[PDB]
Amino acid sequence: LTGTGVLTESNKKFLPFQQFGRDIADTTDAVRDPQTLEILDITPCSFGGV
Amino acid sequence: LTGTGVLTESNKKFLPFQQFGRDIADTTDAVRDPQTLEILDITPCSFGGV
Amino acid sequence: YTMSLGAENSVAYSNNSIAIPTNFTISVTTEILPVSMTKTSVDCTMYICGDSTECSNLLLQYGSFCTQLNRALTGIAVEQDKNTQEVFAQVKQIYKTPPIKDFGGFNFSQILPDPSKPSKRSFIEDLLFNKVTKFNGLTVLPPLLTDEMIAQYTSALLAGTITSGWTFGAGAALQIPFAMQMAYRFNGIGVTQNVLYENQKLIANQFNSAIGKIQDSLSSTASALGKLQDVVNQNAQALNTLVKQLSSNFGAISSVLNDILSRLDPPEAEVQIDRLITGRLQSLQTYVTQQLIRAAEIRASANLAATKMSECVLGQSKRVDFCGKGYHLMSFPQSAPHGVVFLHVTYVPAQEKNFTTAPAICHDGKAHFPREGVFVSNGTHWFVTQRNFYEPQIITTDNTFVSGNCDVVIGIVNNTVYDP
Amino acid sequence: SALGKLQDVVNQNAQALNTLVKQLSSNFGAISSVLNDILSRLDPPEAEVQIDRLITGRLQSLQTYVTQQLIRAAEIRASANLAATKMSECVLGQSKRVDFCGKGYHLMSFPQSAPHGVVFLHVTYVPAQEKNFTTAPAICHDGKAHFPREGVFVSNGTHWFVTQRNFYEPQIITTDNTFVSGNCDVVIGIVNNTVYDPLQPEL
Amino acid sequence: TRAGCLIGAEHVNNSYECDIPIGAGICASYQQSIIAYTMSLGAENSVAYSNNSIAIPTNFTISVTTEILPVSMTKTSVDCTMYICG
Numbered sequence: 001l002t003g004t005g006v007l008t009e010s011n012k013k014f015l016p017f018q019q020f021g022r023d024i025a026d027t028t029d030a031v032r033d034p035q036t037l038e039i040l041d042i043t044p045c046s047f048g049g050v
Numbered sequence: 051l052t053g054t055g056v057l058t059e060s061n062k063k064f065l066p067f068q069q070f071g072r073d074i075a076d077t078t079d080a081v082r083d084p085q086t087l088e089i090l091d092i093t094p095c096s097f098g099g100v
Numbered sequence: 101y102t103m104s105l106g107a108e109n110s111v112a113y114s115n116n117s118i119a120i121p122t123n124f125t126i127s128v129t130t131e132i133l134p135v136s137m138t139k140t141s142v143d144c145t146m147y148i149c150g151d152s153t154e155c156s157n158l159l160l161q162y163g164s165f166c167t168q169l170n171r172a173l174t175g176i177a178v179e180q181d182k183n184t185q186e187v188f189a190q191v192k193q194i195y196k197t198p199p200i201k202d203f204g205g206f207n208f209s210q211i212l213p214d215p216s217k218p219s220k221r222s223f224i225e226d227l228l229f230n231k232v233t234k235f236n237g238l239t240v241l242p243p244l245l246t247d248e249m250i251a252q253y254t255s256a257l258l259a260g261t262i263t264s265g266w267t268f269g270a271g272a273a274l275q276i277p278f279a280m281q282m283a284y285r286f287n288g289i290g291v292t293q294n295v296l297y298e299n300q301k302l303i304a305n306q307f308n309s310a311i312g313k314i315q316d317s318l319s320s321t322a323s324a325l326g327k328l329q330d331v332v333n334q335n336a337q338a339l340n341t342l343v344k345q346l347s348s349n350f351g352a353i354s355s356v357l358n359d360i361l362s363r364l365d366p367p368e369a370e371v372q373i374d375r376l377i378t379g380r381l382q383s384l385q386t387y388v389t390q391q392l393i394r395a396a397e398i399r400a401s402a403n404l405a406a407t408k409m410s411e412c413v414l415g416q417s418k419r420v421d422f423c424g425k426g427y428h429l430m431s432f433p434q435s436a437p438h439g440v441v442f443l444h445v446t447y448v449p450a451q452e453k454n455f456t457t458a459p460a461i462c463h464d465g466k467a468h469f470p471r472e473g474v475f476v477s478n479g480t481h482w483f484v485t486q487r488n489f490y491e492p493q494i495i496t497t498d499n500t501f502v503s504g505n506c507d508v509v510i511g512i513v514n515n516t517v518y519d520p
Numbered sequence: 521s522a523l524g525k526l527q528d529v530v531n532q533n534a535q536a537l538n539t540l541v542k543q544l545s546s547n548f549g550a551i552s553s554v555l556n557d558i559l560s561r562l563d564p565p566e567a568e569v570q571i572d573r574l575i576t577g578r579l580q581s582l583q584t585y586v587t588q589q590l591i592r593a594a595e596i597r598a599s600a601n602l603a604a605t606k607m608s609e610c611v612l613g614q615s616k617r618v619d620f621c622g623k624g625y626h627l628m629s630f631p632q633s634a635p636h637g638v639v640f641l642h643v644t645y646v647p648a649q650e651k652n653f654t655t656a657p658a659i660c661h662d663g664k665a666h667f668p669r670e671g672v673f674v675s676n677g678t679h680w681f682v683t684q685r686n687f688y689e690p691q692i693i694t695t696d697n698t699f700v701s702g703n704c705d706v707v708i709g710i711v712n713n714t715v716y717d718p719l720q721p722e723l
Numbered sequence: 724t725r726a727g728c729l730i731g732a733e734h735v736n737n738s739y740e741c742d743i744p745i746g747a748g749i750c751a752s753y754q755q756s757i758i759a760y761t762m763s764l765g766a767e768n769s770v771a772y773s774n775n776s777i778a779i780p781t782n783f784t785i786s787v788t789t790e791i792l793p794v795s796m797t798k799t800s801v802d803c804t805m806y807i808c809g
């Protein structure tokens with residue numbers, strides 16, 4: 001699962017089998033690290049107009 | 051250069067290195083002939099809906 | 101079935117029969133008008149290309165399409181703030197209600213702001229706010245006027261209209277007791293002041309009951325704020341569709357740009373990226389066009405809302421059905437999440453009775469016409485009554501005027517014009 | 521910048537036209553952005569593909585320009601309808617609509633031609649120099665409640681007068697400018713004063 | 724701010740009329756330095772309401788105000804064929 005983001009740790013609780021996470025527009029919003037089995041979280045890198 | 055137009059005796063003053071002149075919005079509007087080296091204002095000949 | 105338009109009612113019309121109301125109802129009705137939509141900014145380069153230099157270089161060949169999309173979106177965004185300013189910033193000086201609220205029995209507790217409340221809104225304002233429900237270069241700019249500040253405009257307008265009536269709309273606010281303001285508004289609809297003053301408690305009770313019924317309708321019944329929710333849903337659906345269009349290959353090998361870059365040489369990858377670019381640019385242009393159309397619709401709605409705020413809240417309108425169904429008395433603004441709710445207080449005649457009516461009265465060979473009323477008869481005696489309320493009065497020279505002899509007028513009757 | 525609204529329309533139209541002209545210089549994937557050179561240095565087959573790319577790009581640009589011009593024309597038509605309504609109701613008559621013909625009580629309006637619009641000079645009446653007075657809804661005289669016909673009962677502290685609602689013109693409480701409606705028990709806030717009867721001194 | 728990070732302007736407690744709209748109620752204005760402030764909605768005028776008090780105007784002002792309304796834009800025609808193809 002390739003992407004670019006900020007890997008904050010979350011408390012989503014994903015069920016034993018579920019690994020990836022998505023939202024209403026199907027964008028990876030959480031992913032469990034294969035080692036240590038921690039839920040984690042994904043947020044986009046900061047962007048905006050100047 | 052290539053186009054359709056009338057070639058009026060231009061009153062503009064080209065610097066020695068300059069060759070042709072584009073007006074606002076990037077449309078060729080003046081050219082200097084090679085052999086005699088004087089400025090020629092190119093004006094597209096009249097057109098309009100009927 | 102085949103729909104029925106309404107109950108077949110034949111008016112009991114006769115050439116000498118009139119119906120005069122003998123009672124009234126103070127009805128407060130809500131009108132919800134959108135005033136603005138979410139200010140969304142879509143960076144064209146990030147949306148079409150993400151973070152690829154090859155895609156950006158290819159997109160440069162298309163010229164100023166992205167800049168034009170950005171300028172159109174910025175125009176829409178600033179137009180939303182202009183709409184909010186026009187609707188709500190119609191008041192100079194933030195008027196405040198007195199600590200002691202003696203308004204002749206009228207209760208504006210549900211409409212006035214509440215300090216314990218988070219945004220200093222009214223009760224109805226929290227009802228309205230509770231009823232309603234950054235990726236790929238999409239940003240949502242916050243509105244210039246936050247919810248607290250729009251609520252403060254609403255409170256200022258409401259306090260001004262309660263305290264000074266319509267005077268603050270023209271110039272400086274001029275204090276006036278609310279009973280006398282309501283009496284002058286009664287004079288506006290053609291009803292004399294004595295009707296209000298003699299029925300002040302009943303009218304205050306009717307207004308309080310109507311406000312309570314509006315409260316109950318908002319609290320219990322969902323989907324009342326249909327227009328605002330429709331605008332929000334349309335904007336969200338448009339943005340979601342714009343996001344979803346990034347998952348379409350548009351005839352390319354893949355809908356993801358990095359894969360095409362990785363597993364193809366730059367020549368063929370150039371053609372595939374060109375297909376992706378033209379598809380995404382078409383999608384973005386469609387989005388901007390529909391946003392412009394929706395922004396025009398919202399601007400029309402906000403213009404109507406500003407007109408209603410000027411002509412119903414800052415004054416009393418004689419335009420029929422402009423500020424509610426009935427004879428307009430006054431109006432109250434309330435801040436809505438993306439619009440404004442006007443509580444129109446109107447006068448509705450009720451409990452009518454039929455009488456025998458005459459155009460004029462022949463007395464001493466002279467035709468008398470009412471100055472401001474109508475000649476009614478209960479069966480045996482004739483009276484002058486004001487048109488919108490049954491207040492019979494003896495035929496006198498003070499309330500009638502003479503014009504010619506009594507043979508020209510069709511339907512004239514015989515009665516005595518008492519001379520004081 | 522007083523005529524900002526007209527200059528905004530002029531600038532928007534000029535900017536749209538300039539963008540449309542500048543779009544002619546874009547390649548849109550073709551080898552050259554000028555059609556004559558493409559026809560000059562290519563055979564009909566390849567020149568056909570290049571011209572097709574240029575055609576699709578320029579046609580898309582023209583379609584965008586026409587769509588935005590249509591939207592701007594709808595906006596301008598709404599503005600022109602509002603201007604016509606203001607000409608009809610503010611200039612050709614006196615309007616009771618609040619803030620339709622200026623901030624205040626509308627008196628009249630004058631039109632003035634503008635290069636691409638109209639300027640309305642709204643002459644309006646604005647009350648000023650207000651004063652506070654004591655006030656009662658009615659006056660109980662001889663057990664009868666008297667209400668003002670078209671004015672307001674006011675008091676400077678010791679005497680009660682009738683004044684028009686928008687200008688301080690105090691007048692003696694008389695039967696001419698008041699009307700009687702029932703006793704003085706029902707109405708709330710009524711005060712006591714003598715309603716001078718014009719007929720009695722003459723008799 | 725709620726709109727974002729503003730660099731080069733100093734926050735002030737005072738509230739003034741909006742000059743340059745940053746957003747979320749915050750504006751910026753030049754006063755030697757550029758200041759950023761929550762905009763002032765207006766003066767606080769508590770009208771002296773009472774159940775037996777009125778305010779009657781004793782004078783007036785004739786005010787003439789200008790309203791500018793666009794009525795037409797430039798009638799432009801773009802020949803599609805010669806624009807696209809010359």
Ligand SMILES: *[C@@H]1O[C@H](CO)[C@@H](O[C@@H]2O[C@H](CO)[C@@H](O)[C@H](O)[C@H]2NC(C)=O)[C@H](O)[C@H]1NC(C)=O
Binds near residue numbers: 034035036
């Ligand atoms: C994959 O291997 C890692 C490496 O050993 C495992 O992580 C260890 O988990 C145990 C369980 O408590 C810890 O005591 C160790 O300290 C962890 N290792 C390190 C280096 O911290 C991980 O559990 C394995 N994944 C599985 C078994 O699913």
Ligand SMILES: *[C@@H]1O[C@H](CO)[C@@H](O[C@@H]2O[C@H](CO)[C@@H](O)[C@H](O)[C@H]2NC(C)=O)[C@H](O)[C@H]1NC(C)=O
Binds near residue numbers: 207208209210
């Ligand atoms: C105006 O209406 C509000 C709400 O209907 C009144 O507030 C209520 O007052 C009663 C006492 O009469 C309390 O028991 C309630 O708890 C109050 N709140 C609600 C939500 O009902 C208020 O008293 C009314 N104003 C006047 C002057 O009577």
Ligand SMILES: *[C@@H]1O[C@H](CO)[C@@H](O[C@@H]2O[C@H](CO)[C@@H](O)[C@H](O)[C@H]2NC(C)=O)[C@H](O)[C@H]1NC(C)=O
Binds near residue numbers: 124
């Ligand atoms: C006019 O209609 C109102 C309805 O609001 C009447 O007021 C009600 O009258 C009933 C008696 O039929 C009472 O039980 C209610 O308590 C009254 N309500 C209020 C708020 O006062 C009123 O009586 C009617 N007037 C006439 C002359 O019939």
Ligand SMILES: *[C@@H]1O[C@H](CO)[C@@H](O[C@@H]2O[C@H](CO)[C@@H](O)[C@H](O)[C@H]2NC(C)=O)[C@H](O)[C@H]1NC(C)=O
Binds near residue numbers: 479480481
């Ligand atoms: C129509 O109205 C007239 C005027 O009120 C009624 O005539 C009076 O009725 C009262 C009854 O309370 C008597 O005391 C008066 O002597 C009557 N004559 C007058 C005042 O001149 C009449 O009864 C009414 N008719 C109907 C059918 O309602």
Ligand SMILES: *[C@@H]1O[C@H](CO)[C@@H](O[C@@H]2O[C@H](CO)[C@@H](O)[C@H](O)[C@H]2NC(C)=O)[C@H](O)[C@H]1NC(C)=O
Binds near residue numbers: 115116510511512
């Ligand atoms: C209003 O309509 C009534 C009913 O048609 C008219 O009354 C008629 O008048 C004529 C001439 O006076 C009589 O010959 C008829 O017998 C009347 N009919 C009835 C049913 O009474 C009346 O003329 C009409 N115009 C008015 C009242 O001005």
Ligand SMILES: *[C@@H]1O[C@H](CO)[C@@H](O[C@@H]2O[C@H](CO)[C@@H](O)[C@H](O)[C@H]2NC(C)=O)[C@H](O)[C@H]1NC(C)=O
Binds near residue numbers: 462512
């Ligand atoms: C109203 O009263 C007048 C006056 O009594 C009536 O006029 C009479 O009309 C009849 C019929 O045309 C004549 O014979 C009389 O000479 C008239 N009298 C006078 C004094 O002019 C009139 O008819 C009455 N109208 C109604 C509708 O009853």
Ligand SMILES: *[C@@H]1O[C@H](CO)[C@@H](O[C@@H]2O[C@H](CO)[C@@H](O)[C@H](O)[C@H]2NC(C)=O)[C@H](O)[C@H]1NC(C)=O
Binds near residue numbers: 677679
């Ligand atoms: C309120 O107005 C009344 C009416 O003008 C004042 O009473 C008169 O005041 C004048 C002062 O110039 C005396 O000359 C009159 O004799 C007064 N009585 C009349 C005209 O009947 C009264 O003084 C005013 N009160 C205040 C507090 O200004």
Ligand SMILES: *[C@@H]1O[C@H](CO)[C@@H](O[C@@H]2O[C@H](CO)[C@@H](O)[C@H](O)[C@H]2NC(C)=O)[C@H](O)[C@H]1NC(C)=O
Binds near residue numbers: 202709710774775
């Ligand atoms: C208008 O407001 C005044 C002031 O609140 C009221 O005056 C009160 O009247 C009652 C009984 O008449 C007294 O017990 C209070 O002491 C008065 N208050 C003050 C501050 O003096 C008045 O009743 C209200 N209503 C009117 C004038 O109709």
Ligand SMILES: *[C@@H]1O[C@H](CO)[C@@H](O[C@@H]2O[C@H](CO)[C@@H](O)[C@H](O)[C@H]2NC(C)=O)[C@H](O)[C@H]1NC(C)=O
Binds near residue numbers: 660710711712
């Ligand atoms: C206005 O005048 C009337 C009559 O002069 C006053 O009515 C008096 O009321 C008191 C208290 O209810 C009674 O004791 C008197 O007998 C009444 N007078 C008469 C002649 O019946 C009324 O109080 C006055 N209003 C004010 C505000 O003072």
Ligand SMILES: *[C@@H]1O[C@H](CO)[C@@H](O[C@@H]2O[C@H](CO)[C@@H](O)[C@H](O)[C@H]2NC(C)=O)[C@H](O)[C@H]1NC(C)=O
Binds near residue numbers: 781
């Ligand atoms: C009403 O206001 C006008 C101003 O709009 C007053 O006219 C001015 O009065 C001052 C005296 O204080 C003079 O110095 C000015 O020359 C006047 N200007 C004009 C244009 O007349 C007027 O006096 C005020 N009227 C009242 C009754 O207060």
Ligand SMILES: *C1O[C@H](CO)[C@@H](O)[C@H](O)[C@H]1NC(C)=O
Binds near residue numbers: 454455456477478479
């Ligand atoms: C009103 O009309 C009804 C039914 O036609 C009639 O019986 C009644 O007398 C009328 N009332 C009056 C006062 O004319």
Ligand SMILES: *[C@@H]1O[C@H](CO)[C@@H](O)[C@H](O)[C@H]1NC(C)=O
Binds near residue numbers: 085086
């Ligand atoms: C070259 O230019 C000069 C000056 O313009 C002209 O006199 C001369 O004839 C030109 N050469 C030829 C071969 O014509």
Ligand SMILES: *[C@@H]1O[C@H](CO)[C@@H](O)[C@H](O)[C@H]1NC(C)=O
Binds near residue numbers: 112119452455
């Ligand atoms: C008098 O008018 C009509 C006549 O049919 C009837 O409805 C009823 O008797 C009365 N109506 C009203 C308005 O009360």
Ligand SMILES: *[C@@H]1O[C@H](CO)[C@@H](O)[C@H](O)[C@H]1NC(C)=O
Binds near residue numbers: 651652653771778
């Ligand atoms: C009467 O009362 C007001 C209360 O603020 C005060 O300004 C003044 O004494 C009077 N009215 C005016 C506005 O002159």
Ligand SMILES: *[C@@H]1O[C@H](CO)[C@@H](O)[C@H](O)[C@H]1NC(C)=O
Binds near residue numbers: 736
């Ligand atoms: C007002 O400005 C002073 C000076 O910087 C600052 O210390 C204070 O926190 C500000 N706010 C208030 C409420 O005093």
Ligand SMILES: *[C@H]1O[C@H](CO)[C@@H](O)[C@H](O)[C@H]1NC(C)=O
Binds near residue numbers: 653
């Ligand atoms: C107006 O109100 C002010 C402030 O309460 C008071 O001093 C003044 O006497 C009042 N004037 C009148 C005529 O009521």
